[PDB]
Design an enzyme around this catalytic site. Structure first.
Site, mmCIF file in Angstrom:
data_model
loop_
_atom_site.group_PDB
_atom_site.id
_atom_site.type_symbol
_atom_site.label_atom_id
_atom_site.label_comp_id
_atom_site.label_asym_id
_atom_site.label_seq_id
_atom_site.Cartn_x
_atom_site.Cartn_y
_atom_site.Cartn_z
ATOM 1 N N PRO A 72 -25.197 -20.020 -22.082
ATOM 2 C CA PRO A 72 -26.259 -20.982 -22.262
ATOM 3 C C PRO A 72 -27.495 -20.384 -22.913
ATOM 4 O O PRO A 72 -28.092 -19.444 -22.381
ATOM 5 C CB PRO A 72 -26.438 -21.560 -20.869
ATOM 6 C CG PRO A 72 -24.953 -21.713 -20.442
ATOM 7 C CD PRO A 72 -24.211 -20.595 -21.162
ATOM 8 N N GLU A 73 -27.801 -20.894 -24.100
ATOM 9 C CA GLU A 73 -28.901 -20.379 -24.933
ATOM 10 C C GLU A 73 -30.079 -21.324 -24.876
ATOM 11 O O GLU A 73 -30.120 -22.238 -24.041
ATOM 12 C CB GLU A 73 -28.389 -20.159 -26.367
ATOM 13 C CG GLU A 73 -27.112 -19.326 -26.317
ATOM 14 C CD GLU A 73 -26.592 -18.755 -27.618
ATOM 15 O OE1 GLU A 73 -27.217 -18.842 -28.700
ATOM 16 O OE2 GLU A 73 -25.438 -18.241 -27.511
ATOM 17 N N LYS B 276 -34.778 -18.823 -22.859
ATOM 18 C CA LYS B 276 -33.866 -19.024 -21.735
ATOM 19 C C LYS B 276 -34.560 -18.874 -20.402
ATOM 20 O O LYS B 276 -33.900 -19.045 -19.357
ATOM 21 C CB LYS B 276 -32.691 -18.045 -21.917
ATOM 22 C CG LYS B 276 -31.744 -18.502 -23.024
ATOM 23 C CD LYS B 276 -30.902 -17.312 -23.587
ATOM 24 C CE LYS B 276 -31.360 -17.039 -25.038
ATOM 25 N NZ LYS B 276 -30.665 -15.804 -25.570
ATOM 26 N N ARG C 61 -21.475 -7.315 -28.347
ATOM 27 C CA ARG C 61 -21.162 -8.713 -28.050
ATOM 28 C C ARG C 61 -20.087 -9.193 -29.035
ATOM 29 O O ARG C 61 -19.881 -8.631 -30.102
ATOM 30 C CB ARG C 61 -22.412 -9.547 -28.225
ATOM 31 C CG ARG C 61 -23.626 -9.041 -27.440
ATOM 32 C CD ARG C 61 -23.496 -9.228 -25.914
ATOM 33 N NE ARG C 61 -23.439 -10.644 -25.586
ATOM 34 C CZ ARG C 61 -24.454 -11.480 -25.556
ATOM 35 N NH1 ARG C 61 -25.671 -11.061 -25.803
ATOM 36 N NH2 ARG C 61 -24.176 -12.729 -25.261
#
Ligand SMILES: [Zn+2]
Length: 253
Positions: free
Chosen positions: A1-2, A52, A243
DNA sequence: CCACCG
DNA sequence: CAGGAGAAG
């Protein structure tokens, strides 16, 4: 979730409980228990986001800071309801008709007003891509500034001190939109490319915020093995900045 | 480069 | 059940 997903969540928390007196307040962490009685009868005045980081402001000048990292999630329920879940409950803010529940997040603290500028994350974050006052011209200046013009995009577009709210899917989608891999610096782009990047850094997060819940869709994220919709080459999955990374070898350079 | 779910 | 999926030491 960004950032887009956190702002959508914050909007739902506001629709649920903004302005409504709190009839119960619960925190799992021992150091936050002291605020339960203090917040009963107060209300949430607004739910601010900075990237965030989610800031639940209360009517007595306290603010709950929460950051979901990779795993936290808010749920909105009717009061007294708690659907079975295996997740660990961390915060409950209850009103007469709706309750909001924060599960799983580990980064949760109560802030006094002075801490809204001195908290380590809040002090370091840059401008938020969803802030309508942030313009492509200011983003271009930020890219070209001495502080950021020599930074490789691979890590820059994850660094919240650059632009708050970008995370890995946004990194992958923005670099594909402008035809770039992560191994470039703003100083080396031509003016057309810099302008395209400045616009995409704002417009893709804003489009995702507006339509992920013409609609937002992933062009390369999680589409390895599929043909690129622009050039038809097969999208690849690798790692970049520790990532996952998705990109097209036919049209990203 | 600590912190739910093939 | 080791390891994959935002950020700081
Ligand atoms: Zn392509």
């Amino acid at each position: 979730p960004e950032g887009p997903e956190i702002r959508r969540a914050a909007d739902n928390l506001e629709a649920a409980i903004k302005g409504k007196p709190l009839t119960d307040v619960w925190f799992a962490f021992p150091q936050l228990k002291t605020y339960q009685s203090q917040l009963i009868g107060q209300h949430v005045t607004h739910v601010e986001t900075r990237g965030k980081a989610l800031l639940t402001h209360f009517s007595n000048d306290l603010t709950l800071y929460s950051h979901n990292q990779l795993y936290g999630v808010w749920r909105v329920v009717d009061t007294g309801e708690e659907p079975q879940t295996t997740r660990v409950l961390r915060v409950k803010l209850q009103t007469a008709d709706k309750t909001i529940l924060l599960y799983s997040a580990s980064d949760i603290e109560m802030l006094r007003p002075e801490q809204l500028t001195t908290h380590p994350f809040l002090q370091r974050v840059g401008p938020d891509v969803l802030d309508p006052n942030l313009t492509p011209e200011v983003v271009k200046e930020r890219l070209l500034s001495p502080r950021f013009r020599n930074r490789q995009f691979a890590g820059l577009l994850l660094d919240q001190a650059f632009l708050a709210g970008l995370g890995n899917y946004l990194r992958v989608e923005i670099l594909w939109q402008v035809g770039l891999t992560g191994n470039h610096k703003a100083k080396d782009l031509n003016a057309a490319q810099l302008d395209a990047l400045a616009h995409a850094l704002l417009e893709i997060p804003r489009f995702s915020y507006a339509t992920r819940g013409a609609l937002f869709r992933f062009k390369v994220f999680h589409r390895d093995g599929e043909p690129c919709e622009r050039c038809g080459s097969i999208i690849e999955k690798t790692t970049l900045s520790s990532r996952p990374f998705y990109w097209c070898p036919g049209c990203q350079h």
